Amino acid sequence: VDCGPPDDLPSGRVEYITGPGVTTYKAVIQYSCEETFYTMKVNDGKYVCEADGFWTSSKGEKSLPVCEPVCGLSARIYGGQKAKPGDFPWQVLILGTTAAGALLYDNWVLTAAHAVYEQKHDASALDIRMGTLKRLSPHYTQAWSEAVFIHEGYTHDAGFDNDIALIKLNNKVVINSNITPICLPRKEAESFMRTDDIGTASGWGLTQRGFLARNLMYVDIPIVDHQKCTAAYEKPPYPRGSVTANMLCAGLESGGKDSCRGDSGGALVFLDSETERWFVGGIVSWGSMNCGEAGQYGVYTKVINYIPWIENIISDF
Numbered sequence: 001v002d003c004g005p006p007d008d009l010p011s012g013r014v015e016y017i018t019g020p021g022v023t024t025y026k027a028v029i030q031y032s033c034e035e036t037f038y039t040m041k042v043n044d045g046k047y048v049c050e051a052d053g054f055w056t057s058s059k060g061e062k063s064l065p066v067c068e069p070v071c072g073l074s075a076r077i078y079g080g081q082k083a084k085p086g087d088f089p090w091q092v093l094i095l096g097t098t099a100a101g102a103l104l105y106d107n108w109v110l111t112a113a114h115a116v117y118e119q120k121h122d123a124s125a126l127d128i129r130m131g132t133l134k135r136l137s138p139h140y141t142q143a144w145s146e147a148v149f150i151h152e153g154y155t156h157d158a159g160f161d162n163d164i165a166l167i168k169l170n171n172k173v174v175i176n177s178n179i180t181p182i183c184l185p186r187k188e189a190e191s192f193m194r195t196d197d198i199g200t201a202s203g204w205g206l207t208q209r210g211f212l213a214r215n216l217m218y219v220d221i222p223i224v225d226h227q228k229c230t231a232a233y234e235k236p237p238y239p240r241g242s243v244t245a246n247m248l249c250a251g252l253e254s255g256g257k258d259s260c261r262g263d264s265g266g267a268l269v270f271l272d273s274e275t276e277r278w279f280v281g282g283i284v285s286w287g288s289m290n291c292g293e294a295g296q297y298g299v300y301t302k303v304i305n306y307i308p309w310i311e312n313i314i315s316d317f
């Protein structure tokens with residue numbers, strides 16, 4: 001038959017088992033992911049030359065396996081504390097005004113549409129920095145955007161419904177202990193995001209002093225009841241119905257702990273206590289001008305509502 005030289009596995013290697021350069025009927029190859037920071041999906045990666053001339057998996061598939069980076073690993077802004085290396089290894093800095101995102105896989109950044117809209121529609125690549133706690137440091141891992149996807153239902157400067165965006169990177173980032181992606185929420189993930197469950201926001205945005213932070217900060221804050229969050233913003237100068245079902249709110253009735261301007265696009269993360277992995281439930285979106293004030297909650301894009309959209313973009317590009 002003869003199935004030819006196998007295809008390379010990204011973030012992996014193909015190795016001949018029968019012998020080097022041996023690609024005939026019934027022969028065997030072995031595909032491998034780096035198990036520490038990548039996990040092989042699809043199958044065991046044992047493929048055999050079938051009668052039809054196609055490398056075929058043990059399950060009969062004619063396609064490659066997939067090395068998916070390990071997500072949600074962690075070493076563990078108004079009223080918060082200074083992050084340590086590896087606390088938020090998905091944290092991305094995006095340099096317009098100061099903004100942030102979160103790494104997904106090894107080549108996508110999740111952010112807010114409002115944080116990147118002007119830069120996309122000026123047709124300029126985004127300066128994307130990872131692996132640094134210091135916003136102004138010259139030492140960081142550089143990435144560049146290949147493409148920016150704004151949600152088609154987002155209307156810039158006319159409310160924050162559908163305030164979500166994906167940035168495709170030009171190249172895969174090298175995944176190490178200080179640079180790893182956040183997990184997308186699963187079907188069950190809402191069980192960790194009820195009212196009063198605790199999420200974490202991280203960023204370089206304004207602190208209680210009223211200036212940006214030099215070092216990455218974070219704060220733990222509880223999810224707010226949706227009716228209480230709609231009532232907080234159902235008043236002038238906010239337009240009618242500014243808090244939608246595609247948003248969630250987090251903050252304290254007393255004030256003192258909050259995201260703020262400059263934290264835009266950052267991931268509000270939650271711990272799956274069973275998998276022991278962090279996932280993104282929210283994206284820092286908007287709120288009142290006076291961050292940290294009592295009852296003036298931060299508003300976040302509700303990420304689980306966008307999983308079909310995210311999966312459509314990432315699978316198709």
Ligand SMILES: Nc1nc(-c2ccc(CNC(=O)Cc3ccc(NS(=O)(=O)c4ccccc4)cc3)cc2)c[nH]1
Pocket residue numbers: 114159160237238239242258259260261262263264284285286287288289290291292293296297298299
């Ligand atoms: N109390 C609190 N605040 C935050 C927080 C604030 C801002 C940001 C970053 N987002 C922006 O910078 C976009 C952005 C742009 C303009 C406005 N003006 S508006 O008139 O209020 C308005 C709001 C909604 C619909 C229409 C008008 C607000 C936000 C992050 C957190 C947390 N907690």
